[PDB]
Amino acid sequence: SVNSVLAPGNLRKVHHIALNVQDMQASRYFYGTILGLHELTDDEVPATLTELVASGKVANFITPDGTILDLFGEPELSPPDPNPEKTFTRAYHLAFDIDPQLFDRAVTVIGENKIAIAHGPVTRTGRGVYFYDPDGFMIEIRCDPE
Amino acid sequence: SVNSVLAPGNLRKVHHIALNVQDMQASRYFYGTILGLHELTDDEVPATLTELVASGKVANFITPDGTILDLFGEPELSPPDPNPEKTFTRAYHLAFDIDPQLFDRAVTVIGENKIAIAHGPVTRTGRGVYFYDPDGFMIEIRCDPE
Ligand SMILES: [Co+2]
Ligand SMILES: [Co+2]
Ligand SMILES: [Co+2]
Ligand SMILES: [Co+2]
């Protein structure tokens, strides 16, 4: 027999990407304050996460197009390896798109906030810069050609 | 002095999420064939990834709204832990949205393809089901209320 499979389009979009963070406030600062992602208030999140968001156990940030970044406070968990440069299978990096005219500002923001740059910035097609978040998860900021 | 920071909206969207996979074909089968994500052909990807995609070292899949899932072949890398149930900081899960009327079909597809369900399906607000990909990275398929 032939197994049933989903058709292209059934999975309509990426609803959210979830990250486990050891230091919730350091991560809220990184994603919300420095990177500028808008945060969802307790009354805007699913009734099932209302108290968790209220208690600061979970935080939700969104891009203007609606994609959600969920942060789950896990103070007792460890990273796969203390050194973020050590690679493994599974999640590699998460990349955000930015207006080509704001790419330089992003690089400057990373610098003024003393965030170490893992790779780049690089210019080509497009431009990109890579850096690690508080837990060692790699983030990429990139833009299309002018 | 006050550090410069990005304003809400600067990071306009999630451009792509990258995963490292030990078995490229097993992952192309999982994401493209079973989950139905549309694949980008070598002529549709950035000139910088043309040969990598051609050689099968990298694969790009997309949701209909444009978000890209990059798969990087890493046959020599290991997962953070062989048992996918072991948790760490950093990436937790990636969730895809599906029409509420197709949620049941998705659950059935997972079953017919003998993919073990980590959690769920659950019904509430919304519905959700969780399962691991070939490398042990957790995927969630969810939908809004009817
Ligand atoms: Co608001
Ligand atoms: Co990338
Ligand atoms: Co096509
Ligand atoms: Co989720």
Which residues sit opposite B72 in a β-bridge?
B20, B58
Question: Residue B45's closest chain A neighbor by CA?
Answer: A125
Cβ-based burial of B20 (10 A; exposed 0-12, middle 13-18, buried ≥19): buried
CA distance B65 to B46: 18
- Strand B38-39: give its sheet, edge to edge: A117-123, A127-132, A138-143, A90-98, B11-21, B68-73, B58-62, B38-39
Q: Determine the longest span between alpha carbons in chain B, in angstroms.
A: 60
* Both structure tokens of B21: 């996979």
Inter-chain CB pairs, A–B, below 8 Å: 248
Q: Which of A12, A13, A14 to mutate to test the interface with B (most CBs of B within 10 A)?
A: A14
CATH for A15-146 is 3.10.180.10
- Token look-up 């170490």 returns A116
- Name the experimental technique: X-ray
CB atoms within 10 A of CB A130: 18
The three-point CA angle A138-B139-B8 to 5° equals 45
Q: B59 contacts in A (CB within 8 Å)?
A: none
Which chain B residues have a beta carbon less than 8 Å from that of A23? none
Contacts with B64 from chain A: Cβ below 8 Å: 8-9, 12-13
**What is the A22 CA–ligand 2 centroid distance (Å)?**
24
Contact (CB, 8 A) for B17 and A14: yes
d(CA A102, CA A16): 24
Asked if A91 lies within 8 A of B13 by C-beta distance, the reply is: no
